């Protein structure tokens, strides 16, 4: 079939930093992929546009998607406040992997993370549903603004986002 492709235009303290596009594996994780896609277009009203990456740990991952509380404690899916873990077919095999952040089994909302390294210990706990297609260097560049505990030195936000294909 055809997997959706979405993009994120990143900005640091307002200054445009570049674009990152993802391939969502709708063929294997349809519901999870649809959720991310819809949140990227903003077709349901709420979405990712304007939200920031509140947690960046260099060498581990970049986390964002909490557009309601902006600190990892909020966010919601197009299915409600949270949906079940669709499946664990895909694994965290390396940099670029797009996975779902959560606070335990079946607590998927809108938060996600982009891996900047192989994080095998997350397999079976977080649903992998896509991967970076283009702009991986933009993701690595974002690490420059993170810290060991995740606190970011600058305001990293999703200036704009949408669907390409």
């Amino acid at each position: 079939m055809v997997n959706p492709t979405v993009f994120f235009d990143i900005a640091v303290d307002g200054e445009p930093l570049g674009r990152v596009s993802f391939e969502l594996f709708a063929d294997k994780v349809p519901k999870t992929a649809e959720n991310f896609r819809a949140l990227s277009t903003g077709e349901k009203g709420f979405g990712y546009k304007g939200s920031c990456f509140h947690r960046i740990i260099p060498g581990f991952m970049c986390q964002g998607g909490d557009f309601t509380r902006h600190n990892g404690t909020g966010g919601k899916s197009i299915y409600g406040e949270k949906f079940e873990d669709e499946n664990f077919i895909l694994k965290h095999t390396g940099p670029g992997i797009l996975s779902m952040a959560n606070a335990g089994p079946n607590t998927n909302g809108s938060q996600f993370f982009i891996c900047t390294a192989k994080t095998e210990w997350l397999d079976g706990k977080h649903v992998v549903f896509g991967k970076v297609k283009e702009g991986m260097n933009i993701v690595e560049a974002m690490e420059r603004f993170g810290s060991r505990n995740g606190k970011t030195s600058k305001k990293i936000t999703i200036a704009d986002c949408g669907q390409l294909e």
Binding site: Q63, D66, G72, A101, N102, K125
Partner: peptide, 4 residues
């Protein structure tokens, strides 16, 4: 929300 994790990951830990």
């Amino acid at each position: 929300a994790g990951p830990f």
